[PDB]
Amino acid sequence: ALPADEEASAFRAVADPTRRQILEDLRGGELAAGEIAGRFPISAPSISRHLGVLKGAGLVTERRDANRILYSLAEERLALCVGRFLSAVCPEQIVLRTTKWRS
């Protein structure tokens, strides 16, 4: 779990347009694997592989509930792993804010 390993696996995960779309779909709340597979014109096993890549990179969490795997966005992990680089290269356009604190 070394943070350049975590950056690298996060960048490989968001390299793929299907995986980006799965992450956007999860921003509204937890979705079952079957619901995610229902939204894409590729095979269920191809969606399983995409979801395994996202889970491998810490970008989604998994939970079981009967015969169903439900996926949740891990937005804090994504923000740190991609957002440190992006705010480092684009300091005048992109701000990372992990802090709970607000004005």
Residue 49, token pair as written in the block: 């592989």
Give the three-state DSSP class for 13.
helix
CA distance 19 to 83: 17
Is residue 78 a contact point for Na ion (CB under 5 A)?
Answer: no
Which range binds a copy of itself by CB under 8 A, 33-41, 45-53, 62-70, 88-96? 88-96
CA distance 5 to 81: 10
Is residue 100 a contact point for a copy of itself (CB under 8 A)?
Answer: yes
Is residue 70 a contact point for a copy of itself (CB under 8 A)?
Answer: no
Is residue 73 a contact point for Na ion (CB under 5 A)?
Answer: yes
Residues near Na ion, by CB under 5 A: 72-73
